[PDB]
């Protein structure tokens, strides 16, 4: 189920309570929560 809702969620000027992952090493096995945040390592000079 999905329905439009900015009249409740879009605080004017910008809402910042909503965040989503962008970079992860592995594609995500179905039905798991991966809360923890760390830093991504790309090729040489890995970053932690």
């Amino acid at each position: 189920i999905a329905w439009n809702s900015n009249n409740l969620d879009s605080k004017v000027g910008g809402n910042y309570n909503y965040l989503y992952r962008l970079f992860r090493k592995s594609n995500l096995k179905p039905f798991e929560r991966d809360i923890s945040t760390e830093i991504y390592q790309a090729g040489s000079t890995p970053c932690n």
Partner: antibody
Amino acid sequence: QVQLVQSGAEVKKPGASVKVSCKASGYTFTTYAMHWVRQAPGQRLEWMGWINAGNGNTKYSQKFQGRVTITRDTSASTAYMELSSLRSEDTAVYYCAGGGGRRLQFDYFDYWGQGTLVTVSS
Amino acid sequence: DIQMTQSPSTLSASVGDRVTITCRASQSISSWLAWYQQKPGKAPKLLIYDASSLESGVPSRFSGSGSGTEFTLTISSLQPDDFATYYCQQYNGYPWTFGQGTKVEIKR
């Protein structure tokens, strides 16, 4: 219990700049939310801005745009505030607030610093 | 910008009584609000957020209500620790503002 503590009293002069800072003590830092607010004596509280103690984000006010800045130090787990071009009005008491904990951000201040006193005089 | 004004201003009471506060908004608010207690010479303490919820560690007396614009706080019995101002915070939009201040005094 999370607690916030910060610097003592200050006195400055017009045109100068001042740096107040508060140290955090929280059970986890799940994108913590140090979040500044000020109070002229006997007046309405006024809200400064919020630093994203997770990484670096720096949403600020609009009445105070272009002259106030905020940073934080990860290792010390403190929050840094900076204001310039002061003037006799900004005489106030300055506060640290924030500290959601369960979710990552709010916009309500649930952990308050014990207050910092700033006097702009000549 | 959102304006926040509280119609009651100062109020009166006596121990063991109930009080009410009104917080009106210039515009529509979707039940985004919080209520802070501030004793003189101290730091603010939060009581209610999202206009309804009761935040932990507080006496059960406090209770929020209301939606839309007119918002209300209410306590059943008036304990001594209730003797200070109370502010309402909007957080519907950007720059977040505050109220005016609503103090209560013993009446005799």
